[PDB]
Ligand binder design. Structure first.
Ligand code: CLA
Ligand code: CLA
Ligand code: CLA
Ligand code: CLA
Ligand code: CLA
Ligand code: CLA
Ligand code: CLA
Ligand code: CLA
Ligand code: LHG
Ligand code: II0
Lengths: 194, 161, 170, 42, 742, 73
């Protein structure tokens, strides 16, 4: 009746606890509006992108593909540094992978229409780490939590790069308190523009 | 260059436009003291004007005899960023809006009260539809070839004539 | 029928002892016009802010974190406003308040008590009886603290003395 | 939140006003950060 | 005690359920849309309460709470005007230099280059110049600081919250019964005594204790932050007796009837204050005190609960003579059972009062420094002429709604209404003849002059230098008013207004007011005014008198107030309803008010406003061309519209470029209206059929079947866009012209 | 629209000032002030309180045209 995550709120509907990482944390009631399968597929995919993204920013500073173009320590700087044609090629590769993996089930209306389709289940298991049912639940639990943690970490790492124009590891190695004189929050309305 | 036009970066009339636009702001600035809010407002407007003229000069736009940029829209690729690419962006957005609106009117026909779904919109379903529009070219052409976009002439009411 | 708190005045008719702290004091009559659940949640929220604030005023005079410069608490507001530290506090308070809106809806449906956020980390309230004592006490502390807040904010305005120093002085 | 108040917010004039205010608003913001875009920059 | 308070408790439940059910209020609309007409029908009939409900009680309750909703909106609007003056204005700079700084209380954000609208209004400030005259109001009130403007803004917000609460409370919690609303004697007693009388008395008290000392110090030359706060005048009676020594005697002269002690601050000066060009505030204080006295006296006339007083029914039924049958019998029952009859009267009177306000405020400028702020004088004259014309046409709209709906012949036998309806042919034929006579002999003089000037015959024109049509009666009245001080108003020191004659009042070398001479051009344009007013009366009166039946349609009342026609037979009965005479009379109101505001603008620029150079000579804005050029149509076209549109059309790239854009946009909307006015519904429904076909082809037809607008709605849309475009074109033209040159 | 375009383009060319059409024709205020308003002045001065000339008949026809058109309304 009362959510585990938030006791004063009532437990969200459409959350039965079947999915790993189901803690009843849906205060806004978004689950009622949007089907859980679409939300879980979104959550898992968003998290997987973030897991690679966080690891990538730290790895990009530590390791660079040979050549000046790949040498930028700060990942935001790396965005400009990398050859544009290759980046656009990556964008096309991501699109084609999305197209084949979903089996043309791209839209919210037509995704999950097939009964066997399961949230996040793109049938990607080349080495069959998850083939054993014994370890299936723990793998699912870890993947969902890693994704949530990664999203929080990536948001922090991007914004910390914005506040101080430093790569993530060096900010840990050499720490500067934000002066706060620069980049005051908003203020467009207050000073009547300009 | 094309059609006897001049690149805006070397047009003298473009340069006189930039200079006259800045003198007009500087004479308004000559009536205010340095740190006042009207002085900061006009100095930010002089920076915006100079930035715009600099960007236009280096963009490959062509100026006329009047010193204003002119747009070439005959299809040549050196000028596709003035009509062809904005036009492709528009048609992608417009076809999205049309595909999504059409999907909702077909959904609303199968409703308990079809006309109540159009003055009180089912917002979760309509948001399911707005998300689908990103692949409208493929969905709409497959809709067309599978005989579900176009209805035959004999299921359409017409005037007696 | 007459109100217990004030004998001459009449019992409001929505104040029947349903909510703890009821002494029948509602001369203006807002309880009749508006839902009492909203008002009780507002009373607890206003009181909790005030109870924290009076302690915060006193403690800030007693001890201050070294990194921030020592300032009078009433005038500290302006420094934090420019620094951005005050904006950080507002943002987090607003974020919790967003969940509070959902909780207000839970109260209106009947799933929540007016001021219950299920906060018992230290498990102070062992049983219903001690909780009853605490809820009446919380109401009294909130009401008194709402009076006490502005008690020395207004005194600060008349006399530029720290409330602790002012209490000892004169 | 009340289901009848949400059914009121789903009425055509409310959605039309909110959606076109949101639409007008990100056109305004895009022209604040990226002004004077006479052409697609290419 | 038959006048008593009676209330139903908790009548209507405060629920969001009917919010989710558009159209809940009528049986027709509550079953949902099937064509797009439903959508329009929803908005058209929503505040027509007596069309949804049969009972006068529920109608009255809905009206009372909707009046609280309107008050809540007005208080929010006033609070916003005070807040924009407090926060986004140059008010403080304007107080120091009222003659140099231009008032501005609106600042734009910089987005698409629109920050060019922040022009240099003066006082180290950039913003949109405002013309509502709020700065002069605030100086007359004695505000002197932005802090007091913040407190006025908060008082407005609190009043707005209390009015929206009162509307909710009095509809949903405690709704008065019909017998409460049907207390006309009590309502008049309280609204004369309480509302108007104590309103005037309380304002007189403020003028005496705050406006008079603060404005005496301001006009002496004291800086605004050097002036004592308004309560130090209330307490320190010595400081008040410095400025006005009569205050040394207190209230003993008031109570002992030795009123001539108070002549320091209760004067009868007349004329204008030479420093500010406004009315003496001692005169306004005495004026409001005297008006307060006789509004409180007038609110004791009618009988409520103690036997003293008049019965309004007895007064009405007793006034009957030999020409008028039963007389005013049955009028009390009409005006205490029909809201439309009351709204018809109150709208006609409120519109007339707004027209009087427009004339009296330009001629006797009440506020300090408003007479030489020419954009404000033109703005508030034009604004209150338009409010007056609209409200007068709504008075005839609701007289027609009464006649069609609330009129009952059984209760109106042989009284004044019955007799008007029984000789409406004699009324409408004589009015028709007057409108023809008066268009021929007013506009035909203009055509005679166009022809004579074009033919080279200037000795054959109606002009001052030719055949003269002098306004001798108006000139004679002006003579009497200049002779009145010391003669027929012996204790007055100056004339009521310098428009009648007398001196030139100059403030900051600009003319505040000066005699407005009347000549042949003034004779002609005053008969133009009488012609356009008589024709508007003809259209609206013919709609009211023939609203129920005609020789054409014998049963027009069964079709209603608003119907498009009764078919193409009888030759054609298009636009036969009473609604269609309001529709046609709003065009002629527009014509009338447009000529009035053009006459005012050209005459004031040509003969009143301008600059006073050395030797006392006055150089007017357009140099006295009215006299010899307002006598031809070519003169109005060339020397007024063409010459003075220079500022709107040259405004691009300046702070007045918004007016140039609105000038063009309103020209557009006006022209766009003619698509709806010259067209018919049948064409547009047949065009919509082919568009619907193209939607059926793509399987995207809507379930709410599209319709062409109704015949009445095509007329209403055409009229709305016509008025919006025409008034908007004049609004932009007037404001850019007078901001540049005045 | 056709004859306004033909006439404005030709009077600007015939004056020697084709650049006035070139710059002002791209917005509607250019058509309003530089064609209708600017060229009205010899026409509406065909008669005035200072005399008349041979353009007095067109100056009358101009007003005549405004009257009939509005009477059509
Ligand atoms: C009542 C008359 C009135 C008018 C006409 C204006 C007009 C204006 N004000 Mg002022 N203002 C007023 C009252 C008024 N104000 C009052 C009472 C206050 C005191 C609180 C203020 C305080 C104020 C400030 C502090 C500022 C303004 C500003 C402005 C300007 C821009 C406003 C804007 O774009 O924000 C738009 C803001 C939005 C959030 C957009 C909302 C759009 C939504 C979608 C409208 C929808 C309404 C909704 C659908 C209704 C139905 C409800 C729903 C349940 C169905 C504009 C000149 C600004 C200014 O001048 O800056 C220089 C500014 O900064 N106003
Ligand atoms: C002294 C008594 C009094 C006063 C001041 C008013 C005032 C008003 N009545 Mg009336 N009314 C009265 C007695 C009174 N009424 C009685 C006895 C009846 C029963 C017969 C009615 C029945 C009645 C109806 C049926 C309607 C009104 C309406 C109105 C409003 C008209 C619009 C207007 O000018 O408001 C603007 C002018 C103002 C001055 C705004 C003032 C707002 C408050 C309410 C005024 C009084 C405040 C307070 C007494 C002053 C305190 C002073 C203090 C600071 C010292 C106005 C508020 C109409 C309306 O709009 O309803 C809301 C309406 O439809 N009244
Ligand atoms: C460590 C987090 C983690 C975990 C526990 C899982 C677990 C799972 N995934 Mg997920 N996945 C991940 C990361 C993860 N994946 C990433 C990063 C991507 C791509 C961006 C994906 C993409 C993906 C898809 C598309 C699908 C799955 C599926 C599955 C399920 C079956 C496959 C399996 O058992 O893998 C077991 C996984 C592990 C035991 C951990 C992976 C660690 C590998 C062995 C080493 C990788 C090292 C790497 C190079 C990091 C660099 C180190 C750095 C310091 C430089 C299972 C629940 C399928 C499924 O059933 O969905 C529900 C499915 O359809 N995953
Ligand atoms: C999304 C719904 C939709 C779709 C797919 C179409 C499709 C079409 N319309 Mg129709 N139309 C619509 C809505 C729609 N219309 C509405 C609401 C109106 C009333 C203003 C019209 C008025 C209209 C006219 C007058 C004409 C067309 C024409 C056309 C055709 C050519 C495209 C065109 O001219 O667009 C033109 C579009 C407009 C003029 C108005 C569109 C207004 C908005 C942008 C569309 C509605 C958005 C809607 C609210 C979607 C909400 C979705 C959400 C609930 C999920 C094509 C058959 C033309 C035709 O028959 O040519 C063959 C034609 O002459 N339409
Ligand atoms: C849509 C309606 C509308 C709007 C938007 C405005 C807008 C404006 N009016 Mg106008 N006005 C209107 C209708 C309207 N008026 C009508 C119908 C009347 C006739 C009663 C007037 C009479 C009027 C006067 C007399 C004055 C304005 C003024 C103003 C300006 C300042 C607003 C303000 O603070 O008032 C402030 C108003 C005052 C400080 C004094 C008002 C004194 C009157 C006599 C109060 C009467 C109230 C009473 C209840 C009405 C009884 C009506 C009677 C028939 C029984 C502003 C331009 C003022 C102005 O021009 O300032 C430059 C001004 O002095 N208005
Ligand atoms: C509702 C309107 C209103 C209000 C609230 C007030 C309120 C007040 N008036 Mg004012 N007054 C008003 C209308 C009003 N007056 C009008 C219309 C007139 C013209 C006849 C006056 C003329 C007037 C005078 C001449 C004096 C006051 C004074 C006062 C104060 C009364 C002190 C007293 O009794 O001793 C009064 C002194 C005695 C000897 C008795 C008080 C602040 C007195 C004051 O304190 O001035 C600041 C004072 O001397 N009033
Ligand atoms: C105190 C003033 C007052 C009051 C209370 C009423 C009240 C009423 N009138 Mg009356 N009326 C008034 C003034 C008033 N009117 C005036 C001044 C006029 C002259 C124009 C009329 C002319 C009139 C007619 C001709 C009719 C009414 C009708 C009605 C009734 C229906 C109202 C409705 O549902 O409209 C709903 C409201 C709307 C649809 C609003 C839209 C109206 C315009 C086009 C929008 C405003 C444009 C805006 C101000 C500017 C836009 C800016 C732009 C740049 C975007 C209602 C009893 C009707 C009826 O049948 O009564 C029985 C009717 O036929 N009235
Ligand atoms: C410029 C346009 C124009 C003109 C001239 C008229 C003219 C007239 N309208 Mg119309 N009207 C117009 C626009 C116009 N209207 C528009 C746009 C609307 C839309 C709502 C209406 C709606 C309308 C209504 C609803 C009413 C009128 C009425 C009138 C008449 C007013 C009485 C009058 O002045 O008689 C005098 C005639 C004139 C001033 C016309 C000009 C004549 C001048 C002096 C020259 C005459 C030259 C001479 C005859 C030449 C002879 C020789 C020649 C034959 C060779 C008159 C016939 C009213 C009416 O008929 O009641 C009497 C009436 O009720 N009109
Ligand atoms: C699950 C998703 C989680 C998202 C978490 C977001 C975290 C960051 C959010 C802000 C952190 C604190 C920043 C304070 C920042 C701050 O205080 O700056 C100030 C700025 C206004 O300026 P002021 O009036 O404060 O000027 C200050 C003066 O003192 C000096 O000029 O506030 C805003 O308006 C920003 C918000 C834009 C509002 C529109 C945003 C986009 C709207 C999209 C549609 C509406 C959706 C709902 C929006 C609420
Ligand atoms: C609930 C919850 C928990 C918790 C918690 C917390 C944070 C509890 C904190 C509670 C607090 C801070 C209570 C403070 C009340 C203050 C009052 C009533 C004011 C008194 C002042 C007066 C009367 C005065 C005065 C005066 C004036 C105005 C000015 C002077 O010149 C003079 C004078 C000094 C006389 C925990 C986490 C422990 C777990 C638990 O499971 C659940």
């Amino acid at each position: 009746a009362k959510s585990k995550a938030v006791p004063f709120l009532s437990q969200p509907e459409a959350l039965d606890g079947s999915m790993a990482g189901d803690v009843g944390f849906d205060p806004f009631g978004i689950s009622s509006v949007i089907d859980i399968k679409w939300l879980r597929e979104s959550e898992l995919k968003h998290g997987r992108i973030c897991m690679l993204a966080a690891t990538g920013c730290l790895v990009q500073e530590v390791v660079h593909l040979p050549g000046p173009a790949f040498s930028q320590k700060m990942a935001l700087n790396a965005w400009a540094a990398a050859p544009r044609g290759g980046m656009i090629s990556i964008l096309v590769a991501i699109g084609l992978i999305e197209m084949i993996s979903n089996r043309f089930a791209l839209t919210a209306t037509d995704m999950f229409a097939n009964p066997n389709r399961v949230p996040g289940d793109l049938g990607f298991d080349p080495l069959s780490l998850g083939a054993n049912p014994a370890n299936r639940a723990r793998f699912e639990l870890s993947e969902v939590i890693h994704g949530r943690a990664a999203m929080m970490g990536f948001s922090g790492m991007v914004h910390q790069m914005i506040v101080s124009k430093q790569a993530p590891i060096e900010q840990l190695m050499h720490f500067k308190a934000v002066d706060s004189s620069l980049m005051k929050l908003g203020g467009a309305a207050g000073n009547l523009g300009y | 260059d094309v059609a006897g036009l001049t690149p805006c970066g070397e047009s003298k009339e473009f340069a006189r436009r930039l200079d006259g636009s800045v003198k007009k702001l500087q004479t308004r600035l000559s009536k205010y003291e340095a740190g006042t809010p009207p002085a900061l407002a006009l100095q930010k407007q002089i920076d915006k004007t100079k930035n715009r003229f600099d960007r236009y000069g280096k963009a490959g736009l062509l100026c006329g005899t009047d010193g204003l940029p002119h747009l070439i829209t005959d299809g040549r690729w050196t000028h596709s960023g003035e009509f062809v690419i904005p036009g492709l962006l528009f048609l992608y957005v417009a076809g999205w809006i049309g595909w999504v609106g059409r999907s909702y009117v077909l959904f609303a026909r199968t409703a308990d009260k079809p006309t109540e779904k159009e003055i009180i919109i089912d917002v979760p379903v309509a948001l399911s539809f707005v998300s689908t529009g990103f692949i409208w070219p493929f969905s709409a052409f497959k809709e067309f070839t599978s005989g579900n976009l176009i209805v035959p002439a004999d299921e359409i009411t017409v005037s007696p004539r | 029928d007459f109100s217990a708190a004030v004998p001459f005045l009449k019992r409001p008719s929505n104040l029947d002892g349903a909510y703890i702290g009821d002494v029948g004091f509602d001369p203006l009559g807002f309880s009749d016009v508006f839902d009492l659940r909203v008002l009780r949640e507002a009373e607890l929220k206003h009181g909790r802010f005030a109870m924290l604030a009076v302690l915060g005023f006193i403690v800030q005079e007693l001890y201050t974190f070294p990194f921030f410069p020592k300032m009078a608490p009433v005038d500290a507001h302006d420094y934090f406003v420019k620094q951005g530290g005050g904006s950080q506090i507002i943002f987090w308070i607003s974020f919790v308040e967003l969940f509070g809106v959902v909780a207000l809806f839970e109260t209106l449906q009947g799933k929540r008590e007016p001021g219950d956020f299920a906060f018992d980390p230290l498990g102070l309230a062992k049983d219903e009886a001690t909780l009853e004592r605490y809820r009446l006490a919380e109401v009294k502390h909130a009401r008194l603290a709402m009076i006490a807040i502005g008690g020395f904010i207004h005194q600060y305005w008349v006399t530029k003395q720290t409330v602790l120093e002012q209490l000892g002085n004169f | 939140m009340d289901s009848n108040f949400l059914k009121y917010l789903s009425t055509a004039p409310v959605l039309f006003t909110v959606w076109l205010s949101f639409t007008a608003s990100f056109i305004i913001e895009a022209n604040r950060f990226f002004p004077d875009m006479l052409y697609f920059p290419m | 005690k038959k006048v008593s308070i009676t209330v139903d408790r908790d009548p209507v439940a405060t629920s969001f359920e009917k919010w989710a059910q558009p159209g809940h209020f009528s049986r027709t609309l509550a079953k949902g849309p099937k064509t797009t007409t439903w959508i329009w029908n929803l908005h058209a009939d929503v505040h027509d309460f007596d069309s949804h409900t049969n009972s006068l009680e529920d109608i009255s309750r809905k009206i009372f709470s909707a009046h609280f909703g309107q008050l809540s909106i007005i208080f929010l609007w006033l609070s916003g005007m005070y807040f924009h003056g407090a926060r986004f204005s140059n008010y403080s700079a304007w107080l120091s230099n009222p003659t140099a700084v231009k008032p501005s209380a609106q600042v734009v954000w910089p987005i698409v280059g629109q920050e060019v609208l922040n022009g240099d209004v003066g006082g180290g400030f950039q913003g949109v110049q405002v013309t509502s005259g709020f700065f002069q109001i605030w100086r007359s009130s004695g505000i002197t600081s932005e802090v007091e403007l913040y407190w006025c803004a908060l008082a407005g917000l609190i009043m707005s919250g209390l009015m929206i609460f009162a509307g909710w409370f009095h509809y949903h919690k405690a709704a008065p019964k019909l017998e409460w609303f049907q207390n006309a004697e009590s309502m008049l007693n309280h609204h004369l005594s309480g509302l108007l009388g104590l309103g005037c008395l309380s304002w007189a008290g403020h003028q005496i204790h705050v406006s008079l000392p603060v404005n005496k110090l301001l006009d002496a030359g004291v800086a605004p932050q050097e002036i004592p706060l308004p309560h130090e005048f209330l307490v320190n009676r010595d400081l008040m007796a410095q400025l006005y020594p009569s205050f040394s005697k207190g209230l003993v002269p008031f109570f002992t009837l030795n009123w001539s002690e108070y002549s320091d601050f209760l004067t009868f000066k007349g004329g204008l204050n030479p420093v500010t060009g406004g009315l003496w505030l001692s005169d306004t204080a005495h004026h409001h005190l005297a008006l307060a006295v006789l509004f409180i006296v007038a609110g004791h006339m009618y009988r409520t609960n103690w036997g003293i007083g008049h019965s309004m029914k007895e007064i009405l039924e007793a006034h009957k003579g030999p020409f008028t049958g039963e007389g005013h019998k049955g009028l009390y029952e009409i005006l205490t059972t029909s809201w439309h009859a009351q709204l018809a009267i109150n709208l006609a009177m409120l519109g007339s009062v707004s027209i009087i306000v427009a004339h009296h405020m330009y001629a006797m400028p009440p506020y300090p420094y408003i007479a030489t702020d020419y954009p404000t004088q033109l703005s508030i004259f034009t604004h209150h002429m338009w409010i007056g014309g609209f409200c007068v046409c709504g008075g005839a709209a609701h007289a027609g709604i009464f006649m069609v709906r609330d009129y009952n012949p059984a209760q109106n036998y042989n009284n004044l209404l019955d007799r008007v309806i029984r000789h409406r042919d004699a009324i409408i034929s004589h009015l028709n003849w007057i409108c023809i006579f008066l268009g021929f002999h007013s506009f035909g003089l203009y055509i005679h002059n166009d022809t004579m000037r074009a033919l080279g015959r200037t000795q054959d024109m109606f002009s001052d230098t030719a055949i003269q049509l002098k306004p001798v009666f108006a000139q004679w009245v002006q003579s009497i008013h200049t002779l009145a001080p010391g003669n027929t108003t012996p204790n007055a020191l100056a004339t009521a207004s310098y428009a009648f004659g007398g001196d030139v009042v100059a403030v900051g070398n600009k003319v505040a007011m000066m005699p407005i001479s009347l000549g042949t051009a003034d004779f002609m344009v005053h008969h133009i005014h009488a012609f356009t007013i008589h024709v508007t009366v003809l259209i609206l009166l013919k709609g009211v008198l023939f609203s129920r039946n005609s020789r054409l349609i014998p049963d027009k009342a069964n079709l209603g107030f608003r119907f498009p026609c009764d078919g193409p037979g009888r030759g054609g009965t298009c636009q036969s309803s009473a609604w269609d005479s309001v529709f046609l009379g709003l065009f002629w109101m527009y014509n009338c008010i447009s000529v009035v505001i053009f006459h005012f603008s050209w005459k004031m620029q040509s003969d009143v406003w301008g600059t006073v150079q050395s030797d006392g000579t006055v150089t007017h804005i357009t140099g006295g061309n009215f006299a010899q050029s307002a006598i031809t149509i070519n003169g109005w076209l060339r020397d007024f519209l063409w010459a003075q549109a220079s500022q709107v059309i040259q405004s691009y790239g300046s702070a007045l470029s918004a007016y140039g854009l609105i000038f063009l946009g309103a020209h557009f909307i006006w022209a766009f209206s003619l698509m709806f006015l010259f067209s018919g519904r049948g064409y547009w429904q047949e065009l919509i059929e082919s568009i619907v076909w193209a939607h059926n082809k793509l399987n995207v037809a809507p379930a709410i079947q599209p319709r062409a607008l109704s015949i009445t709605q095509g007329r209403a849309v055409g009229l709305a866009h016509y008025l919006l475009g025409g008034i908007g074109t004049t609004w932009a033209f007037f404001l850019a012209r007078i901001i540049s040159v005045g | 629209w056709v004859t306004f375009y033909w006439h404005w383009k030709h009077i600007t060319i015939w004056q020697g000032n084709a650049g006035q059409f070139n710059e002002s024709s791209t917005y509607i205020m250019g058509w309003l002030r530089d064609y209708l308003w600017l060229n009205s002045s010899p026409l509406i001065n065909g008669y005035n309180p200072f005399g008349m000339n041979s353009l007095s008949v067109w100056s009358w026809m101009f007003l005549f045209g405004h009257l009939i058109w509005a009477t059509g309304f």
